[PDB]
């Protein structure tokens, strides 16, 4: 493939940060510093990762050029993101307005952190990938630039607090999806 | 006097930041970058400012070497600080434990800012002078280092918010002192 082993490794690290990654190849390329690559080359590599995991899991490993891919690890990351993929709108206008529909416990960032901040953190994780805290901070529309990752390393929320909060919010989404499925009677 | 006109001017700027300044000559010297000066030289200059204001106000101006001192301006600053001078303990152990005894309205710093933060801001103003926000931030015991003057200029409280808050708290102290004088019947 028209990629180096180092480029394949960056692609796989970024692929693991999203749900439905084959529909997020430009966000993956941006995150993996592969913006220069063609849409056809990105689609080909993404489908090698997607199809490789299916073949290995129908732990198990597979190769992409000289890179060894842990199929269980990719899919464990994808499973953790299922509630986010199912909850956040794919439509951009709708996504901008997304609000978490359930009550959230206090964040304890020693700051004002409310429902809209939780909502924008989840939109940022959808847009930039799980763990892409600097990219979410740099987004000029999510209103987190002057809230997250303070310059002062003793002030919250730093990456640790964002990871804790994000994991809590994604678990809340999982519980909410199950409750809505049970209440509606629609599987 | 054993001081330059530039040194006299720094001394007067720092003198205006305290109540009972003649009892705060070391804090004045620290603030005015005059730490090198002897206690006798500092006392002599301070008494020239104190006695000069009395003579001019028994606007009116007086001279210290080649420096023109506005007596009304010095005394207006000293009057604004009367409630702070009368409320904060002069004893160091007691001062460390000082808590504002009345209810304070919300600060709107978009952070957690409570009674102890207001109290420590007032102790810092007493110790370092009105407007000495960086010195108060640098104090390792007042617990404001990671709260005030954020590195991010869009985050609060910056100097503007500290000035607004301090003026509000000193007015609250003035009202509290008058109420306690009326309630006790002791002038």
UniProtKB/Swiss-Prot annotation, chains A, B:
Cellular location(s): Nucleus; Cytoplasm
Tissue: Expressed in many tissues including in the brain, where the highest level of expression is found in the cerebellum and basal ganglia.
Residues the record lists as Phosphoserine modifications: 38
Disease entry from the Swiss-Prot or TrEMBL record: Pilarowski-Bjornsson syndrome: An autosomal dominant disorder characterized by developmental delay, speech apraxia, intellectual disability, autism, and facial dysmorphic features. Some patients may have seizures.
Entry comment, domain topic: The 2 chromodomains are involved in the binding to the histone H3 methyllysine at position 4 (H3K4me3). The CHD1 helical C-terminal domain (CHCT) binds DNA and nucleosomes.
UniProt function note: ATP-dependent chromatin-remodeling factor which functions as substrate recognition component of the transcription regulatory histone acetylation (HAT) complex SAGA. Regulates polymerase II transcription. Also required for efficient transcription by RNA polymerase I, and more specifically the polymerase I transcription termination step. Regulates negatively DNA replication. Not only involved in transcription-related chromatin-remodeling, but also required to maintain a specific chromatin configuration across the genome. Is also associated with histone deacetylase (HDAC) activity.
Subunit and partners: Component of the SAGA complex. Interacts with BCLAF1, NCoR, SRP20 and SAFB. Specifically interacts with methylated H3K4me2 and H3K4me3. Interacts with the FACT complex, the PAF complex and the U2 snRNP. Interacts directly with PAF1, SFA3A1, SFA3A2, SFA3A3, SNF2 and SSRP1.
Similarity-based family: Belongs to the SNF2/RAD54 helicase family.
The protein's name: Chromodomain-helicase-DNA-binding protein 1
Residue numbers of the full-length protein present here: 1124 to 1327 of 1710
